[PDB]
Scaffold this active site. Structure first.
Site, PDB file in Angstrom:
ATOM      1  CG  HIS A  41      -0.594   0.729   2.485  1.00 55.10           C
ATOM      2  ND1 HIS A  41       0.133   0.850   3.103  1.00 55.10           N
ATOM      3  CD2 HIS A  41       0.108  -0.422   3.448  1.00 55.10           C
ATOM      4  CE1 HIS A  41       0.431   0.719   4.479  1.00 55.10           C
ATOM      5  NE2 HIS A  41       0.729  -0.096   4.437  1.00 55.10           N
ATOM      6  N   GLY A 142       3.929   5.880  10.383  1.00 56.23           N
ATOM      7  CA  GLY A 142       4.797   5.526   9.888  1.00 56.23           C
ATOM      8  C   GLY A 142       5.889   4.824  10.186  1.00 56.23           C
ATOM      9  CB  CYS A 144       3.568   0.785   7.678  1.00 56.95           C
ATOM     10  SG  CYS A 144       1.656   1.457   8.055  1.00 56.95           S
TER      11      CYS A 144
END
Lengths: 300, 300
Positions: A41, A142, A144
Site C-alpha cells: 500500500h 510511519g 508500517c
C-alpha cells in the site's frame, strides 16, 4: 530471579531495516539479499486507499518511483513485483549484513519480538503476542513495514510485517509472503476483528512462572478434568484447553511438581473468585502473552 | 497507536558481550576497545564471598587465570586492575565492533535497557527502572556482568552492570566505573535495601500517555497545589513531586491540554479512591517505570 517481558536481541534485524518512499508516503522495508520487502500500500494515495486496484496501480509505477535508502546509501531499484500484499523491490546491491533467516507463519497465541522503526531507522523493540483473533496490541505510530521475528539458534525467523491500524485501534499485518493474519485487507474500510479470547495455555504458563519465582498463594488443593475446566473457561472467554496444550506444559509441571490439571483447577478458582485485591508476579490481572516456551526460555 | 514498555535496539551492545571465566565462576563481560569490564567478584570463591579482601585476592591472580572468550575467539589477558568494584581486563585485541559510547551514572527513577546475557551470549533485552531505593526489579539468573544502557543519537550510554541478587530477591549493581548504586557491597551478607517508593513523576507521565491514547476516564474537574498533592502523596509512599518534575512534564501537558497540577489532582483522587475495578492502558495498577522522556519518545 524476577520475571519480565523479554524481547529477542534485535541486532540481526537492525542491519536489514531500510527506508522506502513512494510519493508522499514513507514507510519501512526489510532488505534481505537483493530484495526489499515492504507493504504494497506504499504505492497508494490516500484516495487510492479507499478502493485500490493494486495490479493497475503497480503497472503505472516505475522503478525510479521507489526511493530506497539504507542509512546513507541510496539503493537503486532494478525491478518490482507483487507478492500477495507485500511489495518486493529488487535492488542492485545485496545486503552485506544479511543474517541467516527464514519466513514462518505463526499460530494464534504465539509470541514474537517487534523492532518498531520509523523512516527505516530502529526506534525500539518489544515483545507481543498474536491474539486469537489475529490482531496484535502493539506500539505503532510511519511504523508500517516494521517486522516481527523470533530467533532460533542462529537463524532469524521473520513472522510478521505491520500493515495498518484498524479504526478500532488494533493492528493487523501479514507474514513475509504477503498473506494477512486474519480476515483483514489492505483497504481503507471498516473491518471487524473477531471476538478476542484469552490464550489459556499462556495464562497457565505464566502461573507456572509465578510458582517458579515463589508466588504461590493461588494454588489450591483440587484437580479437574480438561472437560470440566473448559466448561468454566468458555464462560470467561478463555480459549479451550487441548491435550496438546497439556503436553506443551509438561516440562513446567515437572520443574514445579504441580500437575497441569492441578494448575488448571487453580486457574478455575481464580476465574470464579477473582484475586481479591492480590497480585501475581506484580500484576493484578492474568497475563496471557507468555508462551510455555517463553517461560522455559527465561527461567532456564 | 498503543503503548508498550519498549527497550532500545540492542545491536550495538551485542557486539561487546564476552565470556569471562575465573576458576569455576563464569559471568559476562563488556569488551570496549582493548578492555573487558566485569564484576570483580568473579575472582572470589564461594567461601571468599563471605568476607573478601579483593586487594589480596587480586594480587594472587595471574593474567592466565582469566579466560576471556568472544564468541569463538580466545582473548589473551595482558593485564588486570581493579576499578572500585569493577575488574578491568586489558586484552591484546581491540574490539572491532566498539560503538561510540560513554559511561554515565543515572538518577533514581530513570529507566534504561538491560541486555541480559548468559556465558557471554545475549539472551534477551528488556526495559526497567532504577528504583528510588537504588535496586532494580529485573530478570537475572550467570547473569552477572550484563549491562544497562540508553541510546542518545548514535552514542551508547552505559549506566549499569549487574552484580548480585539480594537475599530479598532484588538486584543490585554498579555504574561502569565500579561505584555501587545504593548502600550495597559485593559481599555475601544480609543487606537491607531502603523502603522503596513510587516514582511519582513517572506515574504522571504514564497518565499522560493514557490520555494521549484515549484512556481518559480518570480525569476530574479539580486542580491542586504541589504542597497539597505531596501531603496526600507521602501517605501512599509516593516520592514528593518537585517543581523540576512539573517542568519536566511540560511538553506532555502542552500536547494534551491538561495542566500538570490538573493531572496531579486526578492522581490524588486515584490514590484515595482506587480504580474501582477499572483499568488504565490495560493495567489495573499505576505504572511508574515510564519516564516523561520515555513517553515523549514513544508517542513521537
Amino acid at each position: 530471579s524476577g520475571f519480565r517481558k523479554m524481547a529477542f536481541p534485535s541486532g540481526k534485524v537492525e542491519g536489514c531495516m531500510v527506508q522506502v518512499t513512494c510519493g508522499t508516503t514513507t514507510l519501512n522495508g526489510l532488505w534481505l539479499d537483493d530484495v526489499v520487502y515492504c507493504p504494497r500500500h506504499v504505492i497508494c494515495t490516500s484516495e487510492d486507499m479507499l478502493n485500490p486496484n493494486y495490479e493497475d496501480l503497480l503497472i503505472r509505477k516505475s522503478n525510479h518511483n521507489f526511493l530506497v535508502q539504507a542509512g546513507n546509501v541510496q539503493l537503486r531499484v532494478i525491478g518490482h513485483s507483487m507478492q500477495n500484499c507485500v511489495l518486493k523491490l529488487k535492488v542492485d546491491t545485496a545486503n552485506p549484513k544479511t543474517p541467516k533467516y527464514k519466513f514462518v507463519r505463526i499460530q494464534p497465541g504465539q509470541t514474537f519480538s517487534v523492532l518498531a522503526c520509523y523512516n527505516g531507522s530502529p526506534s525500539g523493540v518489544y515483545q507481543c503476542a498474536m491474539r486469537p483473533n489475529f490482531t496484535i496490541k502493539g506500539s505503532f505510530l510511519g511504523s508500517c513495514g516494521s517486522v516481527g521475528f523470533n530467533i532460533d539458534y542462529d537463524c532469524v525467523s521473520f513472522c510478521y510485517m505491520h500493515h495498518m491500524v484498524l479504526p478500532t485501534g488494533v493492528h493487523a499485518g501479514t507474514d513475509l509472503e504477503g498473506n494477512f493474519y486474519g480476515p483483514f485487507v489492505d483497504r481503507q474500510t471498516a473491518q471487524a476483528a473477531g471476538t478476542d479470547t484469552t490464550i489459556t495455555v499462556n495464562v497457565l504458563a505464566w502461573l507456572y512462572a509465578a510458582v517458579i519465582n515463589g508466588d504461590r498463594w493461588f494454588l489450591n488443593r483440587f484437580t479437574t478434568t480438561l472437560n470440566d475446566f473448559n466448561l468454566v473457561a468458555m464462560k470467561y472467554n478463555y480459549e479451550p484447553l487441548t491435550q496438546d496444550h497439556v503436553d506443551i506444559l509438561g516440562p513446567l509441571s515437572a520443574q514445579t511438581g504441580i500437575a497441569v490439571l492441578d494448575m488448571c483447577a487453580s486457574l478455575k478458582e481464580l476465574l470464579q473468585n477473582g484475586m481479591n485485591g492480590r497480585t501475581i508476579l506484580g500484576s493484578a490481572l492474568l497475563e496471557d502473552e507468555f508462551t510455555p516456551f517463553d517461560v522455559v526460555r527465561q527461567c532456564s
